[PDB]
Amino acid sequence: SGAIYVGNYRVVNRHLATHNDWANLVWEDSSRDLLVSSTTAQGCDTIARCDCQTGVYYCSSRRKHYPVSFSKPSLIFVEASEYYPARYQSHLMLAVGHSEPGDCGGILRCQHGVVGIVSTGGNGLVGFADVRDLLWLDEE
Ligand SMILES: CNc1ccccc1S(C)(=O)=O
Ligand SMILES: [Zn+2]
């Protein structure tokens, strides 16, 4: 589990979106596993605007933050998980690290702020759904 709380937006894995998120929907992309909903209270997170390939991610299934190198956002084939079939995913950044289903929503952050959230796992890789291209997150 996990979300980015940036202004009056909640960014979550699309597959973990609640009824409330769908009922307060701003934007969703299945290919990216991202869903954004509206909030009443303002949030404490800032979005990275950058092409950093190093940062730190939270891994709930280790209760640990790990420093990682990660690929630039790409179109990647993802094998089957408890929450999705084998399929392609867009704006997905891969690193060497531990990821299980419940780790989805863990923040990846660089010196510039939040880069993305854990989206995929398996074979000792972790995949992050990038949000740094979503400039509209910063305003309105
Ligand atoms: C939809 N575009 C796309 C697809 C795969 C990964 C990243 C991108 S991009 C060039 O926008 O970073
Ligand atoms: Zn950065």
CB 31 within 8 A of CB 76: no
Q: 35 with 14: CB under 8 angstroms?
A: yes
Structure tokens at 123: 């074979």
> Residues 6 or more apart from 139 whose CB is under 8 A from it?
7
Choosing from 90, 92, 131 the residue with most ligand 1 atoms within 8 A of its CB, the one to mutate for a pocket test is 90
Q: SS3 for 6?
A: strand
Experimental method: X-ray
Beta bridge partners of 117: 107, 129
CA of 40 to the centre of ligand 1 (A): 31
